Design a protein around this ligand. Sequence first.
Ligand SMILES: O=P(O)(O)OC[C@H]1O[C@H](O)[C@H](O)[C@@H](O)[C@@H]1O
Ligand SMILES: O=P(O)(O)OC[C@H]1O[C@H](O)[C@H](O)[C@@H](O)[C@@H]1O
Lengths: 929, 929
Amino acid sequence: VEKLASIDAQLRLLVPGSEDDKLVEYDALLLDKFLDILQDLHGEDLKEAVQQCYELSAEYEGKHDPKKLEELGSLLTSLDTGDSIVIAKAFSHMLNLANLAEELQIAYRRRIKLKSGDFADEANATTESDIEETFKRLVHKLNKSPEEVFDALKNQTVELVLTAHPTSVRRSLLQKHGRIRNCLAQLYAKDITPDDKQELDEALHREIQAAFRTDEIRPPTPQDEMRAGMSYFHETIWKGVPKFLRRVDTALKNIGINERFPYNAPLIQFSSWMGGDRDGNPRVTPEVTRDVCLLARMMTSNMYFSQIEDLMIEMSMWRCNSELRVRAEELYRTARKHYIEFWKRIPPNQPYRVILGDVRDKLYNTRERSRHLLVDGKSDIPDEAVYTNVEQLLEPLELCYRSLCDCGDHVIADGSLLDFLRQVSTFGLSLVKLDIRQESDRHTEVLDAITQHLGIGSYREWSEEKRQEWLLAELSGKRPLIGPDLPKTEEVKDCLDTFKVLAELPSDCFGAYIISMATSTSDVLAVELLQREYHIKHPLRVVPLFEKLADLEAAPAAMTRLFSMDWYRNRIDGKQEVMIGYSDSGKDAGRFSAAWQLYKTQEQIVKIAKEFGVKLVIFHGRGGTVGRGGGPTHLALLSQPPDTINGSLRVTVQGEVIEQSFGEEHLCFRTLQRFCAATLEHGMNPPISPRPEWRELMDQMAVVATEEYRSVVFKEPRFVEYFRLATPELEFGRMSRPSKRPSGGIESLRAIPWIFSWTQTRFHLPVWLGFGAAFKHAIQKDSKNLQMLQEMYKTWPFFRVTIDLVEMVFAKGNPGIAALNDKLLVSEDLRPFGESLRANYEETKNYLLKIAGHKDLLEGDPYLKQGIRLRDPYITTLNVCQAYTLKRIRDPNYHVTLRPHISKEYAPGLEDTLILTMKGIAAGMQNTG
Amino acid sequence: EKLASIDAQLRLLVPSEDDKLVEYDALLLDKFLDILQDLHGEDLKEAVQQCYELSAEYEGKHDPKKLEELGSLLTSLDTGDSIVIAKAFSHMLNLANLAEELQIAYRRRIKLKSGDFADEANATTESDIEETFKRLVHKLNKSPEEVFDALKNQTVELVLTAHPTSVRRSLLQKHGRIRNCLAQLYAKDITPDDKQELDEALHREIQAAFRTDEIRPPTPQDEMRAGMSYFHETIWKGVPKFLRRVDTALKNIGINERFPYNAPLIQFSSWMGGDRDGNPRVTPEVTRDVCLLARMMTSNMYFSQIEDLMIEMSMWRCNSELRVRAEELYRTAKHYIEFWKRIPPNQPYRVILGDVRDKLYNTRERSRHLLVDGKSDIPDEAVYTNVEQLLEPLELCYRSLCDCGDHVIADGSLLDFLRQVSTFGLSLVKLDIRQESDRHTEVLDAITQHLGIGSYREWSEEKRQEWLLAELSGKRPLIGPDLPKTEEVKDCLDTFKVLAELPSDCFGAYIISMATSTSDVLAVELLQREYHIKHPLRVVPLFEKLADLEAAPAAMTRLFSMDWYRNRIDGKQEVMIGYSDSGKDAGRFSAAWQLYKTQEQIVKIAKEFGVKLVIFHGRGGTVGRGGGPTHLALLSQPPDTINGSLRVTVQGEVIEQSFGEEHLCFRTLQRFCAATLEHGMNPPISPRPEWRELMDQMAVVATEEYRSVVFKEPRFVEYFRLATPELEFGRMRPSPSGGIESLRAIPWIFSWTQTRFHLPVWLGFGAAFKHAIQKDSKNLQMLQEMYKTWPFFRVTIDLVEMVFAKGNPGIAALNDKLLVSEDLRPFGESLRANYEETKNYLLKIAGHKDLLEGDPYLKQGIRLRDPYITTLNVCQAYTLKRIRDPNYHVTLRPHISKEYAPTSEYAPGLEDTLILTMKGIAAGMQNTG
Ligand SMILES: O=P(O)(O)OC[C@H]1O[C@H](O)[C@H](O)[C@@H](O)[C@@H]1O
Ligand SMILES: O=P(O)(O)OC[C@H]1O[C@H](O)[C@H](O)[C@@H](O)[C@@H]1O
């Protein structure tokens, strides 16, 4: 009768339970159904094996008895390659289930009705403010008129830049995840028949299996990796955006604005790095970039195309204004179809349809030109027949729209037509615009080739002042720099060709050219010059990304110098965007010192832009508090230094967060919602400025933290051998892209790998190291600092948000895993070094607690804690499995007695098991640094 | 918990929406087990579970092995442990019945009903009072005024008899508390804490019941003082609630006034201390005492609530009529305390009600002193000797209120109180007297012989009549103080001295058991005259044997022919009938049909002589079933047999179901009132002559079979004495030499109910059905049309069907095997064969595959009780063996119950175990014949 109630009972033990809190039930059902499936497919024997692992991991998660971990080891390590693959798949798959259940729980959790009004409320989905509440706060708590709010909003832009998953999932598998999540959602609805329940049951059972059996063993091209993206948009964002904008409309009613948000106001914009970012990544060629533009153009046209037919059916009206009636007549007159819904000709009896039919053909053509260009390279298709610019596509829709209003039918015009206008206006002809990123040294290499080939010396050898002097001269040069007959290395050709691609393609494909490892004025001019050389008609804006602390300290001088140049001031036309990267900067100096430095740098650069009349946009690269997703993003955005958003947000949406943020319609909606709300609020309601005591203490702690971080990571010569052993970092490095930009050392290692290696291991060093020294030293210098730190946590959003993130990571941390790793993988001489780090973990964690005023991690956030506690047993099993696998890979001569093979049925090795393991853990850990 | 498991194993017994019964039973059982553990130890708890598991397993499959395994267990228990098990199961039953009461109470009514009369056989589909009114008005062209009028003149008298085995006022209230705790545990918006506390409340109250189990006989006085509980508990409040519903129902058909508060719609009566038929414990002094108790307690009830009405009646505006009488009372210038003060005429309603209170108190005290001393120094002036005296001041208040513009207030508690007073009078119940005809003969014979004029016994009926009428107008007494009297004749004569001394509002009817003739009734009239009873009780013949029924019409005709009698009865005669009694003579079937005809004939006869005839339904009817079935049973009565006046026995074994829970109480009252009303305006169809004819034919055959087996077969009584606890019941009222004709009906029915075989209820139906079908296969169709179309027939078959559902021939078989000698077993086998064949014909006629297809809810109720009953049957059977048999002993298990804490009879505790058993079974079986 009842496997489930028991599985529920044994799942409750992990987190004690309440009202709309279904998570444990959800997880229980999913798990119980999943076990049956393992039984059918692989046999009782294996099912038990899987349960045993779970029981052990769970028992471990409760008490934390290192014995349990070893028992688990004995089990996992005794499995042949075949069975371990299966277990690895199993746990890796129960995780994805646990995440769906959590998405669903988060989606339907009840909002708190009366909120404290504290800014802390904005760090949690249940208490944060929706758009209407935000408007109201601004109007009533801040004396802004509705008109002023409406106005702010009309001018606001929010750009979400999508990056590729650092490990990324299949469009099929997504949809199974959706179907499973829906079956589950549906099983919990009252007024549900025994039959429907029975049928939903088998539907659920079936869709889990279908997912489990979609598990083929692999690398994939940038093109496919990107063609991935065009899914999530279909799946959720494409529909999400109109839904949200309609909510904006409703919210404006309720504060007394009697009009809808203009359909062409560019409130929300999307962008991408996929096929764009070539930094330390030679797989991203010019041809790749040409292909992702054409794909983007294609698919977008296709989307507009597959829904136009539905709008056409809906638009059965015959009453129109004359403006339209003319243009319809024209179009019927000029007539004399590959697809089928409307495969016929259409009576001018129904004019809206005539227009939209033309639109459809044009969309189809636009689809086809991009398709042929993509596969052939030529296409015999006139610009006349096709949308080369979004205005061309809006125009007929605006026509219909106006016509409807004029005939007295605005109410109808504000239905699907409006949604469609909003989609077109948000997504344009290219769903995402592509950013280009390359590292400064590359532009230097190119310019050096040029200068040397010209016989004038070596750009590399020149001083900054010289580079600037030369660059400006040539920026007004009266004759080209570059011949066809210039000697080029493959890299230089690759780089130059990227500009040939930028010149050939329509500019509505592209966003910014980001310069990785920027450090100077010359770095930006260099890119400007090459754009001029290739006669790019609408050059992309150049965006320096300042990474290292020193580079951040130098940035203000660099920006000031830029803004001092008339050539440059006039090219940028009042607008500059600068990029920052929390992970990057924190790899240099620790997370703490990087956080603080970035606060100040933004402040200074804002001040500098203000002085020169420049609107400054700060592009948030990965690693922020602001890329967490969920409520915490809400507060993180409000926590930003004053005037740093100023109506224009641009942030990275880290791949490892795209599912949480967008994969479910409600979360999708609220993601969009908070980005828009927070951005709006901030420009009219900055956080308080830090008290000077706080700046002073923060400066003092930064030095100590950076000292500790660098002591351990760069100064200590034992560290890299430790890292290489205690961590799958090397094995990761036989992949996404070369994680060492072969030079050797941590400074050489890229940040994603850095973060990822220590996340696998549950130890998370890159995120907390240096916080402990900083805290300890500040308290030991003066016990009154504890009070100050606490006041800072209570009152200073930046600080709060900074500590919450590190707290969340400790909650996903477990030093026992780190300890097991030492014991299995690390040599006897390095173990005390490990012990030492674990000691620092603990001490850091405890200070962090003392400062937030919590006994236990996440007291402020039981729901998040519950989510984590539930995932853990699964992750733990993967950690352990991983650890022994790493052993067997590294040590050809480690062997133990293998249990006779357990899986039934009715070529793969350790490396395959390790990948499964790396991906399960990564998906269980989501974002950290 | 282990509840879900107990729920799971309870579901198996009966495989939905508001169907909580299984949960209810599960919880109760799980709580009850814990209690057995605490009090008696794991060891015993398991023993109890084992019995339950076995019984349940048995109830599903019906494997005789299970029964034997159970036997081995039960028969291996020492006297100490078997007592405990017997208490346990006997107590789980009472729990199961409370749960069922609760389930029945809250089951949902069907909203659209077929309109068929079958709908009235089930609580979910039967008609409430409003629906009845509406049917009458719309489907039958009666004006609201005509309905209202019918109702105003309608009387419903419920005569309460004593439980044939009866429960304690304390224990009732525990049953109530348990039932409420349970009801409360199932309510949403309920806290973890309230749930926790209700849990322990529940747990506690079960234990308190379980530990209220002392071993004993009790006096008629106490047995009756029992009654005065159920009224307190439920009827006292029930009546006003229902009458208020009548009021609401009258609104909704457009009558704009309330049911008159003094219209005697509902009246109650009792046999307790009244019925002395074959029961010499019921002496004259007993009868005196139950009148005085009744008078006392009733005064007390009025008294304990008056104080609450007085507080409520804080008004000061009154009419003059009242204001005078108040002034008077204050002008004319306290043991208890609520109002222990004097009262300002400032508040006049209170002044009146204070007087009323004192008068009620005095009335209470006089009855109390008379009861314990025999004299009381208390003037009639100080006291209510007549209900009008108590109404008058209430009507005063009532009128005053309406006159001051406060009728709305007057229709609150005051109205309730008026209704109570008017329904219950000064004596909650009126007492009927019953004695058997032969006794009056014995008395008159003593008299005639002492007078020297011969022997009344020897005289012919014509002679008796001639003498009786002469003496009924005699001009001088019959009886001296000097008359020779046996203890019986004195007992009988003293009863009349008691009737003459006590107020007439204490009494109802004098029922003559074993009536047969006109003289039988005149005899009683004469003795009443002799004792100068100022308001003689009406004489009611109870005709029992079939012959006595066939002779009744001639007897009634003769009575109605006598001017002496016609003028004494003043237009009204009541006649009693007794289904069980008559069915003990001739079989249930022939008795049913004969009673249909007798009623018809006697009705006809009364109609001809201008006499309003009331038929007093004694026990055994379809009409004493309680629940919906009663509803249809009443509607099924022959035309004109109710004629505005229903009088029916409420069998003791049905009082709990009918009244113990406020909702069932209300609906019991409801259907009695509704059915009665409807019938006088909407009789059932009259039987088709073919049907009469076939019924007459089947009656002969059925009587033949019944009498063949019971009276003609000389082996029968030895069979009965062995297969049945009948003898042991007979060491209890005396159930002097025997034979079955001698044995009383309750014992007859009860003996075969214990045994789950139920012979008295079905025997003879099988022969009748078989012979009718074998004479002519077209009869089957006729029988089925009768079942479909003729309420009497339907109702008659449903009852027998219900009994088969409570039947189990395996128990009967086990009994034979354990208790009956080898030579009589084939006789048993033969009866079991008849059981089967009868059951199967009965099914074939109702058109059912299985028993109770028409009634899944009832079947569920039975299925759930059964395992408990089965355990008691088995326990019982072996106990009966050990009692009867010197040659039986088996190895006893070492004692199982723990404990911390002479009483000898026949065998050392067996007799006690048997009683427990007899009472558990009886309470699990409720009503059958
Ligand atoms: O961090 P990397 O290893 O350079 O990899 C790529 C990431 O780098 C930076 O930190 C950027 O700020 C992000 O927009 C990007 O996802
Ligand atoms: O023991 P008995 O002869 O049945 O007497 C007791 C019963 O007798 C008759 O059947 C009456 O109709 C009942 O009102 C009463 O309960």
